[PDB]
Amino acid sequence: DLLRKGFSCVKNELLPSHPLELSEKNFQLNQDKMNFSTLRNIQGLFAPLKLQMEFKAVQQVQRLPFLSSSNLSLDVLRGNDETIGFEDILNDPSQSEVMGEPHLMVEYKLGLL
């Protein structure tokens, strides 16, 4: 603390800089919520449960968070295997300019911090 984090202003975190920041940061979650709500209202409780179970099972076999992963099965299930968005060609995450220590990020993923 105070060295592993810094240059953070509380009064500059409550107010977003741009109208599009929050929508772009949380697009997938809102899309999933809309799809699940429509499916649950049309078919029943079982379909969103099955979809969430499949997503959770697939997302649990990846590399450790300090190395880039491919996410093939998740993209097959979601349907993003034949569409290219702005998240794929801009600011490639496979060539990030900053990265932390391995053990610290693995610990942070588990929530021990």
Partner 1 sequence: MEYLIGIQGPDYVLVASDRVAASNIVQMKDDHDKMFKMSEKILLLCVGEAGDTVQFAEYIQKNVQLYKMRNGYELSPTAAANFTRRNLADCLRSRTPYHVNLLLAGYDEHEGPALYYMDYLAALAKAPFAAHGYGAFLTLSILDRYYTPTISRERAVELLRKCLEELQKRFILNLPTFSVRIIDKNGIHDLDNISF
Partner 2 sequence: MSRGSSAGFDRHITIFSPEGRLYQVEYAFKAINQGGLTSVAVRGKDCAVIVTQKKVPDKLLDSSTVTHLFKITENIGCVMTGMTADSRSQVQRARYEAANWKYKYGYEIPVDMLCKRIADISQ
Partner 3 sequence: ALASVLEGTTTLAFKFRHGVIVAADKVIEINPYLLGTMAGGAADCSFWERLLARQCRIYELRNKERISVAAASKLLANMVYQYKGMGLSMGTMICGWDKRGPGLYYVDSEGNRISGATFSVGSGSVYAYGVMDRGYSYDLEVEQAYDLARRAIYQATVNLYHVREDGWIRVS
Cβ 74 vs Cβ 32: under 8 Å: no
x-or-dash string of contact with partner 2, 29-48, rule CB under 8 A? ----------x---x---x-
**Residues near partner 2 (CB under 8 A), total:** 6
6 binds, among partner 2, partner 3, partner 1, none (CB under 5 to 8 A by kind): partner 1
Task: Give yes or no for residue 15 binding partner 1 (CB under 8 A).
Answer: no
79 is a contact residue toward partner 2 (CB under 8 A): yes
Length of the chain, in residues? 113
Only one residue has tokens 């603390």, namely 1
Contact 100, 64 (CB under 8 A): no
Q: Between residues 6 and 79, which has the closer beta carbon with respect to partner 2?
A: 79
Read off the DSSP letter of residue 103: H
**Smallest distance, partner 1 to C-beta of residue 41, A:** 42
By CB under 8 A, the residues from 7 to 26 that bind partner 3 are 9-11
Q: Which of 4, 5, 18, 56 binds partner 3 (CB under 8 A)?
A: 56
Supply the DSSP string of 26-94, one letter for each residue: THHHHHHHHHHHHHHHHT-SHHHHHHHHHHHHHTTS---TTS----HHHHHHHTTTS---HHHHSS-GG
Name the residue nearer to partner 2 (CB basis): 9 or 84: 84
